[PDB]
């Protein structure tokens, strides 16, 4: 997490880097199969190490609050 930043940058900056990255690094449930093996491959790029499915998602999350509204509408 934010520990790599030492005593630099201040509270908000690193509290948010940790928050974003913790969610970022959480196990994510693949859209194709249902296994929790989705890992970020880069900015907005996600992939399942199980089946290999490579998806377009948010920058730090595979699903964004807006991408979800799409499914409905």
């Amino acid at each position: 997490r934010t520990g790599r930043f030492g005593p630099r940058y201040g509270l908000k900056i690193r509290v948010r880097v940790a928050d974003v990255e913790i969610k970022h690094k959480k196990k994510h449930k693949c859209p194709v199969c249902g296994f929790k093996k989705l890992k970020r491959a880069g900015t907005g790029i996600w992939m399942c190490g199980h089946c290999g499915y490579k998806i377009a998602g948010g920058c730090y999350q595979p699903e964004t609050v807006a991408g979800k509204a799409v499914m409905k509408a």
């Binding site: 948010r16 900015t43 907005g44 998806i55 377009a56 920058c59 730090y60 799409v70 509408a73």
Partner: protein, 237 residues
């Protein structure tokens, strides 16, 4: 005095140009004779150096292989379609007329066939509100209500990469790396920190702008700096 930075920009010298030779593709909707039959398969997902957002590689039926402005939720193997009769699923592109009102859209054309102009940055989207035989009313990400020819093509879904702005850069070095991929001069020296000869706000025994910051629309380049034709300033009221 000397030309101000905003003036050095226009000359298009190396310092101010985008590293175009390093860019991948000019994201534009494919051209279809008609019928809509055109479909393709997503072959890969790549990073777009010009937008800090993902983009999708697609192989079309007629052999054409082109990168595409990827909405969120598109993955390898998916089949995308482009045409009047395209199914109504995310990742597909069709004219605003064939799109059901109330659906989020991206990469909207300004005029039919221009390949897409609006809503293309990370995580954004337009909102098709009203239909008609003459006008398709779309709400752009800025919040504006835009009247467009219903023949203007668009892509179903919101642009991928949403939430990019949520994380702070934290350090100068991170901005640096991003700035190196854009047509921009960075870092930025404040005008008031310069000499009178270099900027209208330059000079003085201490740092402060000489005159008021709100400048007229009619001001000539070299003088148009600060708050341009500001209808108001501050936060109060």
């Amino acid at each position: 005095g000397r030309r101000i930075q905003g003036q050095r920009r226009g000359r298009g010298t190396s310092t101010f140009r985008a590293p175009s030779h390093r860019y991948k593709a000019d994201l534009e909707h494919r051209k279809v004779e008609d019928g809509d039959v055109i479909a393709g398969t997503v072959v890969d997902i790549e990073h777009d150096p010009a937008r800090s957002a993902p983009v999708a590689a697609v192989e079309f039926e007629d052999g054409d292989r082109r990168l595409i402005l990827a909405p969120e939720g598109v993955g390898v193997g998916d089949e995308l379609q482009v045409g009047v009769d395209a199914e109504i699923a995310p990742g597909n592109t069709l004219p605003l007329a064939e799109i059901p009102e109330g659906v989020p859209v991206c990469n909207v054309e300004s005029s039919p066939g221009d390949g897409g102009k609006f809503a293309r940055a990370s995580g954004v989207n337009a909102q098709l509100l009203t239909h008609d035989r003459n006008v398709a009313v779309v709400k752009l990400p800025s919040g504006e209500m835009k009247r467009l020819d219903p023949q203007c093509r668009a892509t179903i879904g919101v642009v991928g990469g949403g939430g990019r702005t949520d994380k702070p850069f934290v350090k100068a070095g991170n901005k640096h790396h991003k700035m190196k991929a854009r047509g921009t001069k960075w870092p930025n020296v404040r005008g008031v920190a310069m000499n009178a000869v270099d900027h209208p706000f330059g000079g003085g025994g201490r740092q402060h702008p000489g005159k008021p910051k709100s400048i007229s629309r009619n001001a000539p380049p070299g003088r148009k700096v600060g708050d341009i034709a500001s209808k108001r300033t501050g936060r109060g009221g």
